[PDB]
Amino acid sequence: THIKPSAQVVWPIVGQEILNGDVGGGFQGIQITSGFFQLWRASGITSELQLYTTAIGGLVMAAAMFFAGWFHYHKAAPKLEWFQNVESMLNHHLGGLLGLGSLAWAG
Amino acid sequence: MKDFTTYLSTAPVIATIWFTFTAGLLIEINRYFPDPLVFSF
Amino acid sequence: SWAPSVFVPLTGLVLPAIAMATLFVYIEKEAP
Amino acid sequence: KEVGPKRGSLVKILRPESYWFNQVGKVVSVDQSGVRYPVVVRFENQNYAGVTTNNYALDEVVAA
Amino acid sequence: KLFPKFSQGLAQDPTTRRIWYGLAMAHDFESHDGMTEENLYQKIFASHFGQLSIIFLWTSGNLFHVAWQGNFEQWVTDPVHIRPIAHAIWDPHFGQPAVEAFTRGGASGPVNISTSGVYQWWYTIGMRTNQDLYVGSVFLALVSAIFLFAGWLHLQPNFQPSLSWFKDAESRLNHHLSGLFGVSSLAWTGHLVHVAIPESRGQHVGWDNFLSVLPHPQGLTPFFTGNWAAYAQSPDTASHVFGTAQGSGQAILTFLGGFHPQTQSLWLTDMAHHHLAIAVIFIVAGHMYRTNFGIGHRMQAILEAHTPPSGSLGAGHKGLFDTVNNSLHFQLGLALASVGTITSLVAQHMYSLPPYAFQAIDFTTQAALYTHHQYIAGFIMCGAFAHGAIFFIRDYDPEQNKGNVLARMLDHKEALISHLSWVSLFLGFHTLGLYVHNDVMQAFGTPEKQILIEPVFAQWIQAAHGKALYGFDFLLSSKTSAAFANGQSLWLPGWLDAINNNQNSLFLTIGPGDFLVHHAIALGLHTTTLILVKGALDARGSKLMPDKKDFGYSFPCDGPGRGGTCDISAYDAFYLAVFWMLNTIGWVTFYWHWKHLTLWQGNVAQFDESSTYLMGWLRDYLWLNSSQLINGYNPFGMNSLSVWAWTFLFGHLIYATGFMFLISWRGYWQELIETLVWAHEKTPLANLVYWKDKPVALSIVQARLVGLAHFSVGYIFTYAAFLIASTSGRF
Amino acid sequence: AHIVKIYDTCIGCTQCVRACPLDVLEMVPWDGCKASQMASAPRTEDCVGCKRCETACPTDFLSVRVYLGSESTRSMGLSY
Amino acid sequence: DIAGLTPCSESKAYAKLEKKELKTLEKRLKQYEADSAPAVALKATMERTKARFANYAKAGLLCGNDGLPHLIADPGLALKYGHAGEVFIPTFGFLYVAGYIGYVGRQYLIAVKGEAKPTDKEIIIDVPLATKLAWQGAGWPLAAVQELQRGTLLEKEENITVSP
Amino acid sequence: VATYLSNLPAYRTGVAPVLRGVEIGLAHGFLLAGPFIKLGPLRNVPETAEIAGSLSAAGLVLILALCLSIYGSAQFLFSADGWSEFAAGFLVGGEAGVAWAYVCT
Numbered sequence A: 001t002h003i004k005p006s007a008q009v010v011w012p013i014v015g016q017e018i019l020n021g022d023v024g025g026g027f028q029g030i031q032i033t034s035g036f037f038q039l040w041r042a043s044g045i046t047s048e049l050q051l052y053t054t055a056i057g058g059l060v061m062a063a064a065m066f067f068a069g070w071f072h073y074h075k076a077a078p079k080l081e082w083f084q085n086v087e088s089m090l091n092h093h094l095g096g097l098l099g100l101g102s103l104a105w106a107g
Numbered sequence B: 001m002k003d004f005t006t007y008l009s010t011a012p013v014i015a016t017i018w019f020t021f022t023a024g025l026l027i028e029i030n031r032y033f034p035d036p037l038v039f040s041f
Numbered sequence C: 001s002w003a004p005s006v007f008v009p010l011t012g013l014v015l016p017a018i019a020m021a022t023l024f025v026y027i028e029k030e031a032p
Numbered sequence D: 001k002e003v004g005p006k007r008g009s010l011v012k013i014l015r016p017e018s019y020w021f022n023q024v025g026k027v028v029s030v031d032q033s034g035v036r037y038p039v040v041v042r043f044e045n046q047n048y049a050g051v052t053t054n055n056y057a058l059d060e061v062v063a064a
Numbered sequence E: 001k002l003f004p005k006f007s008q009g010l011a012q013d014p015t016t017r018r019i020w021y022g023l024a025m026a027h028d029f030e031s032h033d034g035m036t037e038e039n040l041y042q043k044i045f046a047s048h049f050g051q052l053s054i055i056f057l058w059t060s061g062n063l064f065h066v067a068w069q070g071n072f073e074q075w076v077t078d079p080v081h082i083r084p085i086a087h088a089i090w091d092p093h094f095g096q097p098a099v100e101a102f103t104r105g106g107a108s109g110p111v112n113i114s115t116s117g118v119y120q121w122w123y124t125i126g127m128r129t130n131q132d133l134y135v136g137s138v139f140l141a142l143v144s145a146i147f148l149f150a151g152w153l154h155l156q157p158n159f160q161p162s163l164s165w166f167k168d169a170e171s172r173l174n175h176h177l178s179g180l181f182g183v184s185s186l187a188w189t190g191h192l193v194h195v196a197i198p199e200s201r202g203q204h205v206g207w208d209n210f211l212s213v214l215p216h217p218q219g220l221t222p223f224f225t226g227n228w229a230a231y232a233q234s235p236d237t238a239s240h241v242f243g244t245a246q247g248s249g250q251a252i253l254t255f256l257g258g259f260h261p262q263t264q265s266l267w268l269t270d271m272a273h274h275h276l277a278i279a280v281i282f283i284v285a286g287h288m289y290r291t292n293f294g295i296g297h298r299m300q301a302i303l304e305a306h307t308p309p310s311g312s313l314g315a316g317h318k319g320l321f322d323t324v325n326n327s328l329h330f331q332l333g334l335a336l337a338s339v340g341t342i343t344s345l346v347a348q349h350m351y352s353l354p355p356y357a358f359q360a361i362d363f364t365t366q367a368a369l370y371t372h373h374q375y376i377a378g379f380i381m382c383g384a385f386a387h388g389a390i391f392f393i394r395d396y397d398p399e400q401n402k403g404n405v406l407a408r409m410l411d412h413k414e415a416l417i418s419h420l421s422w423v424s425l426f427l428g429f430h431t432l433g434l435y436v437h438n439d440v441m442q443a444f445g446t447p448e449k450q451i452l453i454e455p456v457f458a459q460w461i462q463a464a465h466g467k468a469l470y471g472f473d474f475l476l477s478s479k480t481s482a483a484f485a486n487g488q489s490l491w492l493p494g495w496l497d498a499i500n501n502n503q504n505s506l507f508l509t510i511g512p513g514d515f516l517v518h519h520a521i522a523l524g525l526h527t528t529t530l531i532l533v534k535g536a537l538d539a540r541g542s543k544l545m546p547d548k549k550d551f552g553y554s555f556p557c558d559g560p561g562r563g564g565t566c567d568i569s570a571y572d573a574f575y576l577a578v579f580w581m582l583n584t585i586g587w588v589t590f591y592w593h594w595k596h597l598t599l600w601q602g603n604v605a606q607f608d609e610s611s612t613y614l615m616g617w618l619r620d621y622l623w624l625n626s627s628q629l630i631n632g633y634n635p636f637g638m639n640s641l642s643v644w645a646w647t648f649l650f651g652h653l654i655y656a657t658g659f660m661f662l663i664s665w666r667g668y669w670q671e672l673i674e675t676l677v678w679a680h681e682k683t684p685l686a687n688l689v690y691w692k693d694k695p696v697a698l699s700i701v702q703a704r705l706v707g708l709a710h711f712s713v714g715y716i717f718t719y720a721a722f723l724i725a726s727t728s729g730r731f
Numbered sequence F: 001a002h003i004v005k006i007y008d009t010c011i012g013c014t015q016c017v018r019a020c021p022l023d024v025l026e027m028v029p030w031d032g033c034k035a036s037q038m039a040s041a042p043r044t045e046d047c048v049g050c051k052r053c054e055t056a057c058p059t060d061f062l063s064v065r066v067y068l069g070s071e072s073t074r075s076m077g078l079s080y
Numbered sequence G: 001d002i003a004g005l006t007p008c009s010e011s012k013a014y015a016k017l018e019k020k021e022l023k024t025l026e027k028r029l030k031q032y033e034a035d036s037a038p039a040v041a042l043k044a045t046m047e048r049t050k051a052r053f054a055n056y057a058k059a060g061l062l063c064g065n066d067g068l069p070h071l072i073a074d075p076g077l078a079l080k081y082g083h084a085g086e087v088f089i090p091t092f093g094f095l096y097v098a099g100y101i102g103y104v105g106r107q108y109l110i111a112v113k114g115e116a117k118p119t120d121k122e123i124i125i126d127v128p129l130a131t132k133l134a135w136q137g138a139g140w141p142l143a144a145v146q147e148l149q150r151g152t153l154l155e156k157e158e159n160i161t162v163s164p
Numbered sequence H: 001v002a003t004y005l006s007n008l009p010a011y012r013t014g015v016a017p018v019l020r021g022v023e024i025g026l027a028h029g030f031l032l033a034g035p036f037i038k039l040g041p042l043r044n045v046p047e048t049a050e051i052a053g054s055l056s057a058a059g060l061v062l063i064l065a066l067c068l069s070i071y072g073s074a075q076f077l078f079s080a081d082g083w084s085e086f087a088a089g090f091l092v093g094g095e096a097g098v099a100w101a102y103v104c105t
Ligand code: CLA
Pocket: A013, A014, A015, B026, B029, B030, B034, B035, B036, B037, B038, E429, E430, E432, E433, E434, E436, E437, E440, E449, E450, E451
């Protein structure tokens, strides 16, 4: 309630270190407004170790996505009538993406 | 990787390497020589 | 003293109403 | 005889309303008939319409 | 079918642009059907009579409304603590707080506070009573009616002039230098000496006693004798109360310099000697020319002999008299260039050297007059180049202009446009660079790292004119020089006591913000001439369109081909220059207004610290001085600035509406109007009502003109509401 | 009506006629080029001036040339 | 004192503005522990600030009534009064690099015009040719005046015009 | 609706344009008197609201009746004299309708 959420710190070179304002908590940085700290309290993070490890997991998952696009374009790319199965795409996206994803977030 | 070096020699890649070079030269200068308003000695 | 109460409605409501009429009738006249 | 420049000579354009005025292109063919604009010149410079070739007359044409 | 009587091709137009182009190419007399050059000159002569009659009717209306609904006689008694009155307000839409809010100046009904400066101009030329102003209004109404009779009678065939009478450039340039400028200035000195001087000394000289009241106590004997210095013996003292005889003085042609100490204005005595001297010089320059008497000089011989050899100017000025005399757009272009420059001269010299009594104490008058004549000068200077572009399409002949300066201009047109492009690009790069630099320094809390280049070159001119604030001690601020010493009795000490006063506008002290904004002004001038000179020289052709002269001056485009040709015409290059012109005059009037607001408030340091960076322009001038403007009306009530609070929004509304014609272009709107035509022709009981002109969208050139018109009208109305309210609210 | 003139720089490649959305243009016999044909504008009453003809002309400094003139109900392209 | 000015080491508005900035930094510093990471950066900002004021007063910059350094952009008032490092020395320190880039790009264009198709080596820059012209362009004013003395700097009226 | 449009006066071809303009005038008079008499500038006076709301309504009827004759001189029921009879019938009928609105207060 008295400490401003800050998650961007600048480098003190050309006088731009005035942007590292007194956000509180013994810390200087830019007061963020994207709401990540309230997400992280609502998720139960309580430590920057958990933030660092889900950042490493995000790099791993970004490499998984880049490898996936490389794979499904260059190595094993789906045919046209794979994409035209919109009933299966809707069953899997209502069931697996939206349904199982909110079941997992419920967990 | 000859085609990779021709890609590295395209216009935006040379632009973003040369502008980081001329940016991070002036930035290291303004770190080691703070605030040059006037030509001193 | 009655001039701004008379000349101003004539010049803005009456004489432009002539000008909205007579200068409009002149537009669509059939050329002989 | 074959009037006009030769089959592949460089040439300079003297048509003032052309896009390639005072600008150098290659003759690619000269038509040997009573055509008004026989000299066909191809350029590396394309114009605003994206065209690199044009016909020219004999007085609108000078070598090098 | 009938309304463009001048255009039979527009008369056959079934659409609704028949009306819009009947209104718009009505005064393009050269493109009329059946037009000859003689009927051209006759219609232009009648048109000039119409313009003169409108100017005189307008001035008579100013005089009559001041004499009738104004407080001029009350303003004469106290010209400092009484606001002038333009005209009374009869607005039936008012409420009672609006009626009670606009009653000021000592009147009874709602009134408008005049900012046109006409009380200060009339009070110094002898007007003291309202009866002096009704006579002026009746006289100018009679003269306006005489010019309406004249514009009617010189169209009648017994009085229609010949074709050869209008091409008498020799007799016209003789008579309009000697008679129209010299004799008129001599007569104005006769008004100053006989009427304005004794009324400034408190002696009434009207039409009853001007043959009986001597201007000078020994009059016309020193003029015939030779001792003209007797006309300058006793000037007005430094304790002179204006309009009375308290320490009056008796000279009529003095030569002092500086200002009257009460009115802070130029003395009427050396304004009389000014108009007398330039009357003599205009008469001497007007007996220079050879019309019908053998002696003088001829326009046909001077032009085609000033040719420098060895490839200096080519063939020089050979062949211009065939093209200046035959072209009207060339004459109109030179006339508009001269009038638009001497209008900027009027604007620059009426704030620093205020000629009228108790001007430059009325601050709102001064801001309005400067901004007025500067926008008048900007529009006239862009129209000079517009008609210079119309010249090259309609009037220019290369075979008649073989090798002269007017053909060498088109010969190296690319060098001209590329060097204007370089100067504009340099000025914008470095002016915006130094402003963004100072903004970044002010943002990081380090004001000392600013680029604050001192205006050395203009401080040197102020110190050479006698401003001892900078210590350059060059010519007039140096007490030992010869230009200082040889004028100590002639004209210098009043001028030196008027410059070194730091409370007038006579050579204001200047610093780095004035460096930056004079280079912003130079950016605006060079870019506006880039657009205008590029429109005038590419008016005949370019590599994108080598036959642009075949389409005329105003045309939309040449289609989507060759890459696309939006805004290719010379009209469309005047068009884009009006934006940069309004930009430039807005910069000069922002700078004038803010340096004078900080001068009038006292804190010139508040300008000098803030004008170096664009945030200081935004929040210390635009945000700060628009408080009492926008508080003209609020839910608490309203006051007398509410009419400027409304117009400030009204100008914001027209401006944005201009963008609707500027961003959205025609063809969206024709497709919308076709659906509206469908909806009207399928509606029950609206099928009965049908148009006579088929509704189409506004054409491309028309969309340009309407968007530019709304842009300019919203620009002028916004800044006029801001200027008048920002000055007259706190003052 | 608009003024549609053509010029002798025509190579007879009949692209203005195919580009014309109003059949203003047509190809006429001629002997000034290899194609033995030149365009014509017999039907300039139907021209709107949309200049698709001179987006398609290959000759430098276009052989077809539309000059925007008076506007009738056909030159304005009106269904009403 | 050239044009109503004063040395910044003499004027008191300059020292008052230094004390103003140090006062803002001091009241900003008073919130933190003396050895924490924000306090180190705030004291480093103070040290850079005081070094900046000392080196602006040392170089003889002219302050105004505002207490801010000014730049005399005229040789003969900068050379005579020792202000050539304000504008007159960087007006050639810039132009060396400006004509440097304008010569390197010029020679890269001219050395790529005479090829099979030049445009491919303008989107895909020939890096060894570019770095060769980058290094050997160091003496550009020399080569520029030696090129101007030929007439090989300009081109004659072989250039492209419209209708003079 | 083909049955309903055969009722209102602008489509009844077998009736005169005078009576057409009269019925259109009285059918628009007490309609257009409404927004002037219920919510105009002088509403909170129980003497002048019904007076000003009728005088402004009769003036607006006069504007529309002049504007009809302007349309009739522009365009040429569909005749130069039939539209003039329509305009005069609309003037009389619309002022009668505004007076009838002042009656039924
Ligand atoms: C045209 C307008 C303009 C001008 C004249 C300036 C001028 C200046 N600015 Mg400013 N600025 C501008 C626009 C401008 N700015 C804009 C638009 C912005 C907003 C983006 C800023 C933002 C800004 C900041 C934030 C700062 C400045 C600073 C400065 C100062 C430059 C100090 C510096 O970096 O030294 C550079 C000095 C050199 C000598 C560099 C030369 C490079 C080397 C030495 C030469 C080559 C050697 C060698 C051959 C290279 C090797 C090659 C390699 C391949 C091996 C100077 C007073 C700084 C300052 O101190 O303010 C006073 C600063 O902190 N400016």
